[PDB]
Amino acid sequence: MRIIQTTGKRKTAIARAVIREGKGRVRINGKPVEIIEPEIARFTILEPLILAGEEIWNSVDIDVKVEGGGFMGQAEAARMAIARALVEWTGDMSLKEKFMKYDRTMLVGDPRRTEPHKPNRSTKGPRAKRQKSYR
Amino acid sequence: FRYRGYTLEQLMNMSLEELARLFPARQRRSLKRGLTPEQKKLLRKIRLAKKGKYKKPIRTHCRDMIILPEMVGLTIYVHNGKEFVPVEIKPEMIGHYLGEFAPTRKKVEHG
Amino acid sequence: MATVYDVPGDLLVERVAQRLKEIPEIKPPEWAPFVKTGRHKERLPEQEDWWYYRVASILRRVYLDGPVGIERLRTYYGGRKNRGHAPEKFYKAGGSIIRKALQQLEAAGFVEKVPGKGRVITPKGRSFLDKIATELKKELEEII
Amino acid sequence: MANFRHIVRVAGVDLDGNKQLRWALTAIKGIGINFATMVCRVAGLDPFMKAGYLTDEQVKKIEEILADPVAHGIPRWAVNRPKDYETGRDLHLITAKLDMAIREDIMRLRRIRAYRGIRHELGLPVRGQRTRSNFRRGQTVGVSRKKK
Amino acid sequence: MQKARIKIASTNVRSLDEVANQIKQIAERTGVRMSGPIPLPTKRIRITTRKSPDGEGSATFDRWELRVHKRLIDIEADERAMRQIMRIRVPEDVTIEIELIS
Amino acid sequence: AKPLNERFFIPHEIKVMGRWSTEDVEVRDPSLKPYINLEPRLLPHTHGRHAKKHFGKANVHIVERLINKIMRSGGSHYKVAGHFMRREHRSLNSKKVKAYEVVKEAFKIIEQRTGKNPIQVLVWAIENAAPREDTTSVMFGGIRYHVAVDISPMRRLDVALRNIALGASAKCYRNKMSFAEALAEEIILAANKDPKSYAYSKKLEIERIAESSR
Amino acid sequence: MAKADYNKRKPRKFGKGARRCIRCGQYGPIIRIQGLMLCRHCFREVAPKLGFRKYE
RNA sequence: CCUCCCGCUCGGGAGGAGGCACUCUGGGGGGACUGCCGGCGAUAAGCCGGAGGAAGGGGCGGGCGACGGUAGGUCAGUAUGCCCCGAAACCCCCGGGCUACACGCGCGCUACAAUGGGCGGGACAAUGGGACCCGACCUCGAAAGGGGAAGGGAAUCCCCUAAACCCGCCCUCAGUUCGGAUCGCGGGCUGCAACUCGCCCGCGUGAAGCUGGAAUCCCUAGUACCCGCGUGUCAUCAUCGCGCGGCGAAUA
Structure with missing residues (x-):
């Protein structure tokens, strides 16, 4: 068989993925892909897996562990890594360029994540000032 | 039930412990934990007045004492902050604070 | 061919809560829904399901965790209390529905207290579950 | 169903609506929304159905769980007033007992000459602090208890 | 022999690394088996403070860092092979803790 | 819950929100073709960051554009499952997360009556809700005019979707029109150009006041 | 006349008045x-x- | 390899051996510089557009604020010229006052419901703080809390549960099951002591408010908008100040 370990990181959901051959296993943090309640962020994970095909999804075991705060955050870290897990597998430029033309959130993360809350002039949030009315 | 409690007299004979089940959470606490060394010199001047050595008109800065059944009858002088305001203590005053009855402000109209 | 891991938590909970009516060892005591309930409820419900879900969770949680305490399962529910116009804050549930529940499971043989100081599953609590999940995971492929 | 009505009378002659049993009693002063669902249990009814679907026989089961609730069950913190005026153990409160018991204790303080009774006469919260400018632009809290 | 832990922290970066490196160099050659100098966290300490003593207008607010870094070292040597290695000069200002177990 | 999972087998294949094929519709006008993300795929939430570039906002999934101009109204106050709200408004004093549900249920409530691919009723409601002409109180040379200004295909879309999203919250106001409904009954009637769309009443008036002034 | 010492003798168990600095001597x-x-x-x-x- | 469960015997999951791969931790190194390509520009400076690429043309966010001025602000933090007090404008003490209100405004929180409420279930973080201090876990108590007690001066233990989310169920748009003021009572907790003047828990009580005139403020992207989370100071008053991550735009 094989072991190709990859990563996928979006807004600090770090997905730890492994792609070995088998029988159609989809593991997320220990639980099948079935346990999630929002239908929505599931479909996001599902986007790459059809762009390539069910053929390669069925023939390969994917276990990922996404330690990330967001529900959509987890999903997004799962969308970037499967796509990178499937481009290392087959090896061709056909599956890589087909992802890039569709969206760059499969193969690029961000350049940025979050900004600090500025000291500010005694109010709440990074970018805000106390209200004025002294004119 | 006219007169607060079982009867005015039976709550002078139940003092420590048996009153407690009747009282608020707040009055219990200050009896049960105890009160300060000025509250110990106020147990001589209620006792000089009910009997014996020449009675002083009882004065107090005690506004954290909650009225008991033995102290019902005396005319208590509670310093409002400037001067002493009198209160004739009743059996309907069992279970309230002593600093309620004397004022914490002069009582006038606002404007 | 199934664990509590393989079944969604919306289909698992009415299948274990029924299997807590049926067996029929765990039951509602009368004092626990009446007015000894968890924090504030907009209404108090007169449900068997109410008791059978607060316990059907307890057999899933001790599976995942080791030393799962009373102070953990009181704080694990999710729910608040008003202070006023000051915004709400995070408080914990009623320890009465959690300290009788573990003990209704403890007499049933589903949960046991370990000698390290804590709460773990027995084999009888672990098999009661894997059978109820083998029935749920089998039905989830039949149904489009 | 158990014989449709739109107005059955519960708790004396005061009226039970067609909203829901748990909300129809809340109105009846003394029975709230948590205390309504404590007397649905003892009596043996479905709580979530409409009000007015009651024969004559259900209306008698509620009026005797009200007169003395501390006889049927109802814990000694889950009943309306526990430990009353220093010598009643527990009682019930209803539109006539609640109105009288709260004006009595207020009649008691004014004679006592306290800082609670005259603070309910001038127009003020006692422990809520600010009278500084709240109830602002001519406004008013309405203190206790009803401007509807 | 006696497995010793040298747990060595310092308030600044330059002072902590020189000692960690020197401790792994001198101990290497004698009667010592030594496990490598492992870096644990910086419990960076934030003091977040009001500049202005008026507390007036806009007041610009100082962010403070105190960063304290912790290297850890297991070693298999005697209590006599330990002092030989604890000879070293050490920056001001570098805390060196020693637990001793067999 | 079982239909829900069929809604997970079906978007896979590929379809929006679980059961709307993105091929059902076409953009017949060559104006609104590059300005619309009908053609690309699956999820709005995306977080693909826009306004990054000059037209970093044209490539926005039509529905995502819907979600956040449908999310708009919002201050200060605090939401959580507690007792707790409003704080997420008559238009998300809060997130695109519980926003995306509203638009999904509004695609469900507009599919239930019309029975067409709802992405053929909304893309038929954002080519009609946009006015073709606007007057700006524009002065140039110190001389105050109120002038013929024609509208650009990007600034069209925006006035289409925003007027659709502004009309519904006047109606949902403390009313049985739920935004999942109040939007679904705005999107049908902006597609039609009906006399009941607070979004096709400004479209017209903004062209008609702007014709007088020209 | 005659009297016994004073250097303050009241409760100051806790709060701000309990504290003083080691540079400007304040409560x-x-x-x-x-x-x-x-x-x-x-x-x-x-x-x-x-x-x-100083650096953030 | 080994212990436990389940099984359609194909196969799913946990523990410990075992293994440092991965995440991560903190120390160091490379990578972006208009380098290249086109267009505009005096072939210069520079601006625009393009390719490759994780990232681009101040990459992005902070700290970093000249000579001075408003006689701005503070001698009520300290330092200090001058003046003034001297059983006092000192000193000690208890109690009261700063928390008084017919009202006016500023800055904010909470809020006028179906994008909703109850109930249940399930999937998810980060900064931090923790010895008379964080407190596992076990027990009693409806709960607030009390009794017992492990670990921890810290990547190794604890606060700790994230919240928003979603799925099913009950409920079916009224000043209401909204909203929580006000008042009665029962009860805990700290301190000598919370009436004046603390917070929470339970039952009863259940006020204004059903989208707000003139006028006016804040901000330009991982930002605003939104959701919780921690810390400071610290017994206790936080709808505050500082700071963290989760969802994630409009227009320019």
Whole structure:
């Protein structure tokens, strides 16, 4: 068989993925892909897996562990890594360029994540000032 | 039930412990934990007045004492902050604070 | 061919809560829904399901965790209390529905207290579950 | 169903609506929304159905769980007033007992000459602090208890 | 022999690394088996403070860092092979803790 | 819950929100073709960051554009499952997360009556809700005019979707029109150009006041 | 006349009046309790010798 | 390899051996510089557009604020010229006052419901703080809390549960099951002591408010908008100040 370990990181959901051959296993943090309640962020994970095909999804075991705060955050870290897990597998430029033309959130993360809350002039949030009315 | 409690007299004979089940959470606490060394010199001047050595008109800065059944009858002088305001203590005053009855402000109209 | 891991938590909970009516060892005591309930409820419900879900969770949680305490399962529910116009804050549930529940499971043989100081599953609590999940995971492929 | 009505009378002659049993009693002063669902249990009814679907026989089961609730069950913190005026153990409160018991204790303080009774006469919260400018632009809290 | 832990922290970066490196160099050659100098966290300490003593207008607010870094070292040597290695000069200002177990 | 999972087998294949094929519709006008993300795929939430570039906002999934101009109204106050709200408004004093549900249920409530691919009723409601002409109180040379200004295909879309999203919250106001409904009954009637769309009443008036002034 | 000593003798078990600094000798003004009891104003003057860093 | 469960015997999951791969931790190194390509520009400076690429043309966010001025602000933090007090404008003490209100405004929180409420279930973080201090876990108590007690001066233990989310169920748009003021009572907790003047828990009580005139403020992207989370100071008053991550735009 094989072991190709990859990563996928979006807004600090770090997905730890492994792609070995088998029988159609989809593991997320220990639980099948079935346990999630929002239908929505599931479909996001599902986007790459059809762009390539069910053929390669069925023939390969994917276990990922996404330690990330967001529900959509987890999903997004799962969308970037499967796509990178499937481009290392087959090896061709056909599956890589087909992802890039569709969206760059499969193969690029961000350049940025979050900004600090500025000291500010005694109010709440990074970018805000106390209200004025002294004119 | 006219007169607060079982009867005015039976709550002078139940003092420590048996009153407690009747009282608020707040009055219990200050009896049960105890009160300060000025509250110990106020147990001589209620006792000089009910009997014996020449009675002083009882004065107090005690506004954290909650009225008991033995102290019902005396005319208590509670310093409002400037001067002493009198209160004739009743059996309907069992279970309230002593600093309620004397004022914490002069009582006038606002404007 | 199934664990509590393989079944969604919306289909698992009415299948274990029924299997807590049926067996029929765990039951509602009368004092626990009446007015000894968890924090504030907009209404108090007169449900068997109410008791059978607060316990059907307890057999899933001790599976995942080791030393799962009373102070953990009181704080694990999710729910608040008003202070006023000051915004709400995070408080914990009623320890009465959690300290009788573990003990209704403890007499049933589903949960046991370990000698390290804590709460773990027995084999009888672990098999009661894997059978109820083998029935749920089998039905989830039949149904489009 | 158990014989449709739109107005059955519960708790004396005061009226039970067609909203829901748990909300129809809340109105009846003394029975709230948590205390309504404590007397649905003892009596043996479905709580979530409409009000007015009651024969004559259900209306008698509620009026005797009200007169003395501390006889049927109802814990000694889950009943309306526990430990009353220093010598009643527990009682019930209803539109006539609640109105009288709260004006009595207020009649008691004014004679006592306290800082609670005259603070309910001038127009003020006692422990809520600010009278500084709240109830602002001519406004008013309405203190206790009803401007509807 | 006696497995010793040298747990060595310092308030600044330059002072902590020189000692960690020197401790792994001198101990290497004698009667010592030594496990490598492992870096644990910086419990960076934030003091977040009001500049202005008026507390007036806009007041610009100082962010403070105190960063304290912790290297850890297991070693298999005697209590006599330990002092030989604890000879070293050490920056001001570098805390060196020693637990001793067999 | 079982239909829900069929809604997970079906978007896979590929379809929006679980059961709307993105091929059902076409953009017949060559104006609104590059300005619309009908053609690309699956999820709005995306977080693909826009306004990054000059037209970093044209490539926005039509529905995502819907979600956040449908999310708009919002201050200060605090939401959580507690007792707790409003704080997420008559238009998300809060997130695109519980926003995306509203638009999904509004695609469900507009599919239930019309029975067409709802992405053929909304893309038929954002080519009609946009006015073709606007007057700006524009002065140039110190001389105050109120002038013929024609509208650009990007600034069209925006006035289409925003007027659709502004009309519904006047109606949902403390009313049985739920935004999942109040939007679904705005999107049908902006597609039609009906006399009941607070979004096709400004479209017209903004062209008609702007014709007088020209 | 004659009387017994005074150097204050009342309760000051806890609060701000319990504290004083080790540089400007105050009760109500700031007392940073990390084992560095000073006011906020001293703190700013003292820190570069402490080894704190301005940079965020 | 080994212990436990389940099984359609194909196969799913946990523990410990075992293994440092991965995440991560903190120390160091490379990578972006208009380098290249086109267009505009005096072939210069520079601006625009393009390719490759994780990232681009101040990459992005902070700290970093000259000579001075408003006689701005503070001698009520300290330092200090001058003046004034001297059983006092000192000193000690208890109690009261700063928390008084017919009202006016500023800055904010909470809020006028179906994008909703109850109930249940399930999937998810980060900064931090923790010795008379964080407190596992076990027990009693409806709960607030009390009794017992492990670990922890810290990547190794604890606060700790994230919240928003979603799925099913009950409920079916009224000043209401909204909203929580006000008042009665029962009860805990700290301190000598919370009436004046603390917070929470339970039952009863259940006020204004059903989208707000003139006028006016804040901000330009991982930002605003939104959701919780921690810390400071610290017994206790936080709808505050500082700071963290989760969802994630409009227009320019």
